[PDB]
Ligand binder design. Structure first.
Ligand SMILES: Nc1nc2c(ncn2[C@H]2C[C@H](O)[C@@H](COP(=O)(O)O)O2)c(=O)[nH]1
Lengths: 117, 112
């Protein structure tokens, strides 16, 4: 109970223990810029609830997961991404996941290519 | 503003269907970019994520839960990538919201 939300880097960002460049915050989620951007704009939307990866999300996490996408789309509009953007979730080893706290990437400000990696 | 995905939902043209419920459909992509590449789409015609309404939030999450379950059923134990494209910079190919699920290979970075 000392630190709700765990000790991943993202858990610590939630608790203001590690700095981040915050775009939006509510009771359910946090949006902040990615430190290693892959596009001119590249941010993350994460739940405040710690979930390691999708593949272990519960059925009752549906509205939270959907909220990540709604917040991502609103933040994209607030950031002027008027030509569009790509949303990405990386699951596990083959997805390239590196932080085991669920997160949605939002990338834009350039033409995104196909395939998506 | 119907699309080819509307015709797939209505069963007017064929697709390799993986899962269906009262509110979404999952089917293999006709132009797969990975050994497994499928789509999860809502039955509701939401043209693109940028116009989704805040009442659609749980439906959008349902696409991801269905995607996770279908990935497990298709043997993607090593992981996968989920993608939603918006507009021209996002490379959105059909103006009906859709979640891509790709796996069965290493996915690379950047994601396009
Ligand atoms: N802002 C910020 N982003 C981070 C930090 N550590 C990792 N990231 C980003 C880099 C990657 O795009 C993502 C982690 O990889 P992945 O799990 O594949 O999405 O999170 C951090 O300390 N701050």
């Amino acid at each position: 109970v000392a630190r709700p939300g765990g000790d991943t880097i993202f858990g610590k960002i939630i608790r203001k223990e590690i700095p981040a460049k915050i775009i939006f915050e509510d009771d359910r989620c946090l949006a902040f810029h990615d430190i290693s951007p892959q596009a001119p704009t590249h941010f993350l939307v994460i739940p405040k609830k710690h979930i390691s990866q999708i593949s272990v999300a519960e059925d009752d996490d549906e509205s939270l997961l959907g909220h990540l996408m709604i917040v991502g789309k609103k933040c994209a509009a607030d950031l002027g991404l008027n030509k569009g953007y790509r949303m990405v979730v990386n699951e596990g080893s083959d997805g390239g996941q590196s932080v085991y706290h669920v997160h949605l990437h939002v990338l834009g400000g350039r033409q995104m290519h196909w395939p998506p990696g």
